[PDB]
Amino acid sequence: TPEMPVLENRAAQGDITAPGGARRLTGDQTAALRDSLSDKPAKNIILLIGDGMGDSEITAARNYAEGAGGFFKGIDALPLTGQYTHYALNKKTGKPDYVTDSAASATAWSTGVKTYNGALGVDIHEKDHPTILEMAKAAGLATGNVSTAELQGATPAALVAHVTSRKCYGPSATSEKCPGNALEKGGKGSITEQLLNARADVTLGGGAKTFAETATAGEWQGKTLREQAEARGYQLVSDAASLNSVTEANQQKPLLGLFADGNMPVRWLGPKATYHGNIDKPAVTCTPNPQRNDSVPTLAQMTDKAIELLSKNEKGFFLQVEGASIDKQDHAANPCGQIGETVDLDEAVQRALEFAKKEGNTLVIVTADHAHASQIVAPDTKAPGLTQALNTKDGAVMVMSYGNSEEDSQEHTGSQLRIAAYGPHAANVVGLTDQTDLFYTMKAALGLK
Amino acid sequence: TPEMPVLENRAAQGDITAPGGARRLTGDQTAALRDSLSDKPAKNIILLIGDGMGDSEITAARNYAEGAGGFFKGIDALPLTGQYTHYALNKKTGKPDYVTDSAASATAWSTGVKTYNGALGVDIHEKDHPTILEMAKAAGLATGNVSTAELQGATPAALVAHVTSRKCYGPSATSEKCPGNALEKGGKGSITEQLLNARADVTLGGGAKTFAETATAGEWQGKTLREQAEARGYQLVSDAASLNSVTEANQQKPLLGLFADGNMPVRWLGPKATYHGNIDKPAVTCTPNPQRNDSVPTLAQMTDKAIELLSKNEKGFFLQVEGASIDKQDHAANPCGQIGETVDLDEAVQRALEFAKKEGNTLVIVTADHAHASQIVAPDTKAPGLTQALNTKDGAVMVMSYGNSEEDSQEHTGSQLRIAAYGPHAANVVGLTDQTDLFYTMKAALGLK
Ligand SMILES: [Mg+2]
Ligand SMILES: [Mg+2]
Ligand SMILES: [Zn+2]
Ligand SMILES: [Zn+2]
Ligand SMILES: [Zn+2]
Ligand SMILES: [Zn+2]
DSSP states (O other), rough: OOOOOOSOSSSSOTTTSSSSSSSOSSSOOHHHTTTTTSSSSSSSEEEEETTTTHHHHHHIIIOOOOOOOOOTTTOOSSSSEEEEOOOOTTTOOOHHHHHOOOOHHHHHHHTOOOOTOBBBBBBOOOOOOOHHHHHHHHOOOOOEEEEEEEESSSSHHHOOBSSOOOOSSSHHHHHHOTTTGGGGGTEEEHHHHHHHHOOSSSEEEEEOGGGGGGSSSTTBSSSHHHHHHTTTTTTTEHHHHHHHOOOOOSSSSSSEESSSSSSSSOOOEEEOEEEEHHHHSOOOOOOOOOSSSSSSHHHHHHHHHHHHHHHHOOOOOEEEEOOOOOHHHTTOOOHHHHHHHHHHHHHHHHHHHHHHHHHHSEEEEOOSSSSSSEEEEEOOOOOEEEOOOEEEESSSSSEEEEEEEESSSSSOOOOEEEEESSSTTTTTTTEEEHHHHHHHHHHHHHHHO | OOOOOOOOSSSSOTTTTTTTTTTTSSSSOOOHHHTTTSSSSOSSEEEEEEETHHHHHHHHHHHHHHHHTTTOOTTTTTTTTEEOOOOOTTTTTTOEESSOHHHHHHHHHHOOOBBBBTBBOOTTTTOOOOHHHHHHHHHEEEEEEEEEEEESHHHHHHHOOOSSSSTTTTTTHHHHOOOGTTTTTTTTTHHHHHHHOOOOOOEEEEOOGGGGBBBBGGGGSBHHHHHHHHHHOEEEOOOOHHHHHHHOOTTBOOOEEEOOOOOOOOOOOOOEETTTHHSSOOBOOOOOOOGGGGSSOOOOHHHHHHHHHHTTOOOOEEEEEEEEEEHHHHTHHHHHHHHHHHHHHHHHHHHHHHHHHHHHSSEEEOSSSSSOOOOOOOOOOOOOSSSEEOOOSSSSSEEEOOOSSSSSSSOOOOOOEEEEEEEEGGGGSSEEEEEEHHHHHHHHTTOOO
């Protein structure tokens, strides 16, 4: 009966004030960890990318939603853990750029090669490098791309696009900023155009706006990218009902789920951070965004569906799921939105684990692209940046700060962060690794090449 | 039998700009991990603590001394890794206290009970709790307490003293700050007074200042803590020369090495971070401190001496080695000093893993008490706080930020951080755990009853 265990419960065992009451462990883990090491080939693989979700991020959400003594059933239930570096490179000098953006990190794990901030699917000499998704498709395995942001956004765009700037969303952008990728200029195409070319069996997210653009060149010139997709044989679903009415999704009739003109709506409403907020304003208690909707699929729903549709492929599948606004709300200095996103991710990760655990030959990895702004500080903190007091589950008050920018947004940060995994080859995240290592871990795991 | 290996080389394999160049791994870890798992009895415990050495504090130091593709021979060499929560308790209410102080955190691993920010060896009801050093010794083991700060500083004090306030260094303060702990008021003594009543085989570090303090009661009244020390049977040593002449360290000849009246010297020097310090001031290169001396033992040396003397004991031993000034320099918003202290510790961890790897039954643990202020930002960042640009091993510039306080120092942070281990029972630091588990783990590993 060999089965590989998942953390069924690492919430503080008892009375937080009593001796041993905060212990998350009830005994020796040597044996359970041994039961975790399996180098058998992984048939399927699921990568959960919490965008910007560093260790500070993870702690802040658990404290609020689960309380300090709590435990996320998803994000925290993964047995194997370590810390991987995610620095980028300077295009000019080729030297490390300690703090990456969204495009670069994505490139290095989807391709295995370090690039410069802003690059998608190419290195610093602008040479295209095949992405793991493209290689999985090549090897005949099913492929999935799911996110809560514009599909043209860095994280998901990286699995199917090769452009010198992440900013080249569709024709109009590409033409101007990536004339080398410009269709009407002999180039591969815009992010959106390349997305349509990659033909992943399952792709769900937002950013419908761009699909309203028309091609400057090629076969579907004058027609929109949406009109194209249909002509290309894609099944377009725009809401939860239609999303779940999907019986099959494959290379014949590929699914394209566009559930918003841009990024899908945030889960929790809350005010932004303010200068001297934890003192000059009362504690905040996030509340559900009424726009989240019954017509809008949630993260764990799209995730669930994609596994439902991809599990048909008898050879196996590669799926990426991205909790997109965690990072978007960290720049936004809106703790509530940042946290809601982490909770949402947690639920998707549970769905992943429920399946993986049952199937027995899957590799699930949950991690982030880079660390961010938010910092948990004392209640009476007097800081120069943005700060907000919040009423945690613990019925206590946690204060969060953002102190890495006087301008518009709060920047990403370069600290090394957590990466955890469960399943075949999960042993490859333990200890200190590098974000590119991940590409190889996924590669060898699937048995590619 | 395949006796536990240490992560030989996690540094980048080749040319970071090249595909797979930035990789850290060379194969599948599964098997190396399998020989790392041992539920056998740990004979000695060496615990290295970097005060305020979170993963950010760690990444920067690496980038600086080793370059991004770099690798810390000791710090990064620890095969088993995890993340662990270290919140404190609000005394009056019992509810969690997200950002802790060095005092509350230390007690958590030293006694396995969550207290309130300031306490030492006592709970929220001010009740005492036997410490790990007290249990090890009482079971027969040789014990050692080493640090770079005054020995009455929180991290080292928590192993030997039980008091409501860290401030109660010696007689004077205890009397007016910790009355019930005051010798006159029938208490067990000041921190330093208790340190003496404790009698650890080996005690090294600074703090000499409070030892001039003279007693107000007890069988050593009117006599200074130093006069008492000698009188009680201790052997004092103020420099490296005499520390090396010490061929014994036992219960009826304990060692007390006071290397400074206050905190020992920090390794490197440098300018403190300033407003727009990255934009207005030139980059920096840390200056090795001329005044550290060849007469003042280094952290690595103290560790080395400690282990030699502590190993003559057939029963086994428990040692705690502390990287004190990382927190102090992090508070001081002085990158270079913070960084140099993170390197100094790396050396000690090396010496520890050295003895350990050869010994075959030493559980080596390397972690921090809580997270800190420092954050790695883009070199072009306009931030609200203190920023400093550095000239790294990569021959590139790294920019550090400190913006969580408008007051005197940069605050601690409440993020969850790394915990790495090596040897029998190391499996217990993987995954999410709470800092108090460390107590229970160390106790079980050793076999204390
Ligand atoms: Mg993203
Ligand atoms: Mg300390
Ligand atoms: Zn990002
Ligand atoms: Zn971002
Ligand atoms: Zn501390
Ligand atoms: Zn401190």
